[PDB]
Design a protein around this ligand. Sequence first.
Ligand SMILES: O=C(O)CNC(=O)C(=O)O
Ligand SMILES: [Zn+2]
Ligand SMILES: [Zn+2]
Lengths: 350, 7
Amino acid sequence: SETLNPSARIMTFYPTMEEFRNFSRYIAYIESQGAHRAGLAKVVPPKEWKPRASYDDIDDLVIPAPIQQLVTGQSGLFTQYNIQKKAMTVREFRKIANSDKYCTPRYSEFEELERKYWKNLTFNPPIYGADVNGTLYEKHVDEWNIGRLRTILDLVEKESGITIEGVNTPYLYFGMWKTSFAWHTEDMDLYSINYLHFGEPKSWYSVPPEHGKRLERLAKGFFPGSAQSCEAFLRHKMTLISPLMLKKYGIPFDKVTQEAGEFMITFPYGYHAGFNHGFNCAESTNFATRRWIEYGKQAVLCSCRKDMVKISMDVFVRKFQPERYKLWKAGKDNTVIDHTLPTPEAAEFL
Amino acid sequence: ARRSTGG
Ligand SMILES: O=C(O)CNC(=O)C(=O)O
Ligand SMILES: [Zn+2]
Ligand SMILES: [Zn+2]
C-alpha cells in the first residue's frame, strides 16, 4: 504493498538491454515498484532493439474475418455489435482506412481527438482486422518474443496438450480510426502483452483491480437484462462506458496513449477499454506469474455461451500450492485476494 | 477454445 503507487496511476518503464533480456524477471521488478495497482503499465524498449527489419512486405497478408463495428446508444453508454465481413488483404484494408470516408480527422491536442471519438463513435461504422492468427516477429528475436514468452502459462500446453488461440498463440490486430475495444479483463483473469508494430497510436482507459467490483456493479445497473442472462456479461466484450460516465458515478480510472514501438502490459482483474487513432498493427498474447494462480481459481466466467475460454486450474495447484490441493478440492479454500501485493518473484528487488 | 473481440 500500500506504500508503493498509492495513487494507482499508470507507470512507464525504460529498461536497458540487460534489464530487457529477462521477461518474467522484469514483470516481477515492475510489480515491486507498484505498477500492477493501476491495472495497466507502459514499457519503452531499448532504442537498439528491433523485432523485425522492415514492414514493407506485408500487403499480401490475409485478414480472414474483418469485423464492421456497429455501435448503439447515448449519454456515454453504448453496445457494440461486431459483424463479420468477407476476407481481405492488408492492402485492401489500408486503402479503406486512409480513404476520405474512414480517415483520421484534423486535430491539435489528444483531448480534441478524444472528444471527436465519443461524439462520433455511433456514426460511419469502421472495419477492424482483429483476431488474426500470426506473428510479425523474426525467428531469431529472443527478447520479449510474443510467440514464445516462456512463462508458467506454458504448463497448459505442455501437460494438457491444449492449444488456445490468442491465449497461448499470438494474434495480430489491423486498426483504423474509431475502431474500439470494449471494457473487459483477460480470459481467466490472466496478464496480457500488447506491442504496437507500426502506424497511428492506440489510446487506453484503465480501472484499478482494487476498484474492479465497483465498475461491475455500475454496468449491472445500466444493463439489468444482460446481467440476469449472464453472470460475466462483460466477457462478451460489447460494453462501451465513457470517461465522463465513470467520473459521474465516482469510478476511479486513468488514461494512456501507446505509440509505434511501445509495449503495454495488463495485469490480472485490470479492466481496460480504448480506441485506435488511425491505420496500425498490434501483436498480443496472454501470460502468467505465480500471483495469477489465485486469480484464475476465483475468475467468474461466462455461463450463456459454450465456446468460452476455461483453463483447468488443477495442474497449477498441484505444482505451486501442494499443501492447499486437498483444501481447494473440498471447496474449503477461502483465500481473500490482496490486489496491492506484488508477485512472489519480486523478492530479490526488496 | 478461442480468444475473441465479442460483438
Ligand atoms: O488491441 C485490441 O483491440 C485488443 N487489445 C487488448 O485489449 C489487449 O492487448 O489486452
Ligand atoms: Zn485486453
Ligand atoms: Zn455470457
